Design a protein around this ligand. Structure first.
Ligand SMILES: *NC[C@H](*)CC(=O)OC
Lengths: 75, 368
């Protein structure tokens, strides 16, 4: 299954995933292709921010759905 | 309730910016553009004070200037940033505790009355491209002491002039406490080297202008770590370096330094502020984490800015919003929520320091 991850700059990342993958697994996969530490990633879908412990299937994220990546501010 | 101050050189930058805008040669950043669009005057029809106030009004209650900004039109441009970093604000406050961070604060049995002067430090960190202050005080990545000196002189002197005068009017002297302004997050890569530069800058300012500060008596400088304890005589003034992690028993930022008391001195604390935020910054979201947020939480800063009457929580060291507000809006009821519900904006009187060292209206200083 492929899904997309769109960043603020409109750049689009392609990920290889399974419906049972957790949002935590997805963030880890984002770290692999992009080197962003997972605890800096907010993933948005369907107007919500997504919880690490739930699955893509939980959130009804299907093949070629697009997730939105927003980085954490950090002072 | 509060008073915005800025230097002569900052006024020149403002006049140049306003003229560039009037000519079409610059355009506002996103946040200033929003403030412009909510009022009716064109840039040209607006006086220099009104224009300055609208730029200051584009500040937001909380912003991390060191990481959250792009220094272009999508938030604040470099030209706006160069100005906003120079703007300071003072207010009289009630001080409910000594300013101790986290859990270490000591409540004043009788809350002290004094003043805060919020001043932003040199912004030498960025989540994107270089900042205006980096371009100002760095020579190919190396700190320039004279250039840093001129930056802090620009930003601190108008407040020293103000409180020198205010002490004279109250027939007292001034005791001023200063934290490690610009040595925290703002120092970015220069963290390990910045502290002697800031100390040197404070000394240089007091030394250069000793003749104009006869009512200033005690300067209590506390960068917490990384400096040696010292007292320097600067003219008639006593400049003290007392980093709290180095010198046990050091008096807090919100308390009278040794040799001062309320009968003989007014108490002023400098607050390490932020180019783009309201005074108190992250305490508007309820965080109590920086010099900016801790001192705002420990004073009635939020009441001075909003006009509301908060309540000091002795147990947690926080000045809380009005109790009616927290009941009605529990869950979305921090001070920044009070600002939204009440349509509060940050905008107040502004003066400039002229070439002779008098604080005057922007119009008066511009015409001289
Ligand atoms: N929020 C900025 C903090 C940066 C830092 O940790 O400087 C020491």
């Amino acid at each position: 299954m492929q899904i997309f991850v769109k960043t603020l700059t409109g750049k689009t990342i392609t990920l290889e995933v399974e419906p049972s993958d957790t949002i935590e697994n997805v963030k880890a996969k984002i770290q692999d292709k992009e080197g962003i530490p997972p605890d800096q990633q907010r993933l948005i879908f369907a107007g919500k921010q997504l919880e690490d412990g739930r699955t893509l299937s939980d959130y009804n994220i299907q093949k070629e759905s697009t997730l939105h990546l927003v980085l954490r501010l950090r002072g | 309730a509060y008073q915005l101050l800025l230097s002569k050189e900052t006024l020149n930058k403002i006049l140049q910016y306003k003229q560039n805008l009037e000519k079409g040669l610059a355009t506002p950043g996103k946040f200033f553009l929003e403030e412009l669009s909510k009022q009716e005057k064109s840039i040209s029809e607006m006086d220099i004070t009104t224009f300055t106030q609208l730029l200051i009004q584009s500040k937001k209650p909380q912003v991390f200037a060191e990481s959250q900004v792009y220094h272009d039109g999508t938030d604040w441009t470099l030209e706006e940033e160069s100005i906003l970093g120079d703007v300071s604000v003072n207010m009289p406050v009630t001080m409910y505790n000594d300013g101790g961070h986290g859990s270490s604060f000591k409540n004043h049995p009788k809350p002290i009355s004094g003043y805060l002067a919020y001043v932003p430090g040199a912004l030498l960190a960025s989540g994107s491209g270089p900042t205006s202050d980096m371009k100002e005080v760095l020579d190919n990545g190396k700190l320039n002491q004279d250039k840093l000196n001129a930056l802090y002189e620009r930003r601190l002197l108008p407040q020293l002039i103000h409180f020198n005068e205010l002490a004279r009017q109250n027939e007292k002297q001034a005791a001023i406490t200063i934290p490690g302004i610009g040595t925290g997050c703002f120092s970015g890569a220069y963290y390990d080297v910045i502290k002697p530069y800031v100390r040197n800058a404070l000394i240089h300012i007091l030394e250069k202008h000793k003749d104009s500060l006869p009512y200033i008596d005690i300067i209590h400088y506390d960068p917490y770590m990384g400096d040696e304890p010292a007292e320097k005589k600067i003219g008639h003034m006593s400049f003290r370096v007392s980093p709290s992690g180095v010198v046990r028993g050091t008096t807090g930022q919100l308390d009278y330094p040794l040799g001062s008391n309320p009968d003989t001195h007014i108490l002023v604390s400098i607050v390490a502020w932020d180019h783009f935020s309201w005074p108190g910054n992250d305490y508007w979201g309820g965080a109590r984490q920086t010099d900016d947020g801790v001192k705002a939480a420990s004073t009635d800063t939020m009441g001075q800015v909003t006009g509301a009457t908060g309540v000091y929580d002795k147990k947690w060291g926080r000045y809380m919003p009005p109790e009616s507000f927290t009941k009605d809006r529990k869950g979305m009821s921090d001070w920044g929520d009070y600002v939204r519900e009440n349509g509060i904006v940050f905008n107040g009187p502004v003066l400039a320091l002229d070439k002779s060292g008098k604080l005057d209206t922007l119009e008066n200083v511009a015409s001289r």
